[PDB]
Design a protein around this ligand. Structure first.
Ligand SMILES: CC(=O)O[C@@]12[C@H](O)[C@@H](C)[C@@]3(O)[C@@H](C=C(CO)C[C@]4(O)C(=O)C(C)=C[C@@H]34)[C@@H]1C2(C)C
Ligand SMILES: CC(=O)O[C@@]12[C@H](O)[C@@H](C)[C@@]3(O)[C@@H](C=C(CO)C[C@]4(O)C(=O)C(C)=C[C@@H]34)[C@@H]1C2(C)C
Ligand SMILES: [Zn+2]
Ligand SMILES: [Zn+2]
Ligand SMILES: [Zn+2]
Ligand SMILES: [Zn+2]
Lengths: 50, 50
């Protein structure tokens, strides 16, 4: 995965843990290749294979 | 047009005046119906028909 911080425009959940990507900006990281969305705290918890 | 503030993820220009939508967040307003992107200052300058 190529995770880069993303500022989300509508409520998006973390594809790893299920909770909302909280906040007004920079709520989480979206993988540039597959679109997976994770919380900053959940990025270390995701498997590496994209 | 239904313009709402948008936080852009890559350099986007104003569809009205041609300059970059400056800034890290809330750089401009994107029309929810047609995707037109404008600077906060250019919204008053756009024609109403979408
Ligand atoms: C139109 C729109 O929903 O814009 C927003 C709303 O104002 C806001 C209530 C929002 O929908 C938000 C998007 C995300 C992402 O997960 C997170 C939130 O801010 C959030 O924590 C809650 C509880 C609602 C989410 C985005 C933005 C642009 C801040
Ligand atoms: C990957 C990426 O380009 O992210 C960014 C870059 O860090 C940054 C240099 C950027 O590309 C930016 C998007 C826009 C919109 O017009 C405005 C800018 O911040 C800007 O003023 C300049 C001079 C580059 C633009 C977005 C974000 C997410 C802040
Ligand atoms: Zn991926
Ligand atoms: Zn999570
Ligand atoms: Zn429009
Ligand atoms: Zn403009």
């Amino acid at each position: 995965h190529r995770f880069k911080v993303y500022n989300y425009m509508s409520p998006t959940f973390c594809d790893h843990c299920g909770s909302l990507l909280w906040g007004l900006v920079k709520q989480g990281l979206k993988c540039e290749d597959c679109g997976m969305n994770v919380h900053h705290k959940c990025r270390e918890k995701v498997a590496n294979l994209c």
